[PDB]
Amino acid sequence: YCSDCGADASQVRGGYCTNCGASADRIR
């Protein structure tokens, strides 16, 4: 999941969360 907004990990692309724009390292 994204620690910043809660989105599912499958929504990360190009180094960012595609919902909130968090950097890839905010994914856990």
How do the domains of the chain map onto residue ranges?
A: 1-28
- End-to-end Cα separation, the chain, in angstroms: 6
4 Cβ partners below 8 Å, 6+ apart? Answer: 17, 20, 22, 26
Under DSSP, is residue 24 helix (H, G, I), strand (E, B) or coil?
A: helix
The Cβ of residue 1 has, within 10 Å, a number of other Cβ atoms equal to: 13
Resolution for the entry shown, Å: 1.9
3 Cβ partners below 8 Å, 6+ apart? Answer: 22, 26, 27, 28
How many angstroms separate the CA atoms of 25 and 1, rounded? 11
User: Residue type at 23?
Assistant: S
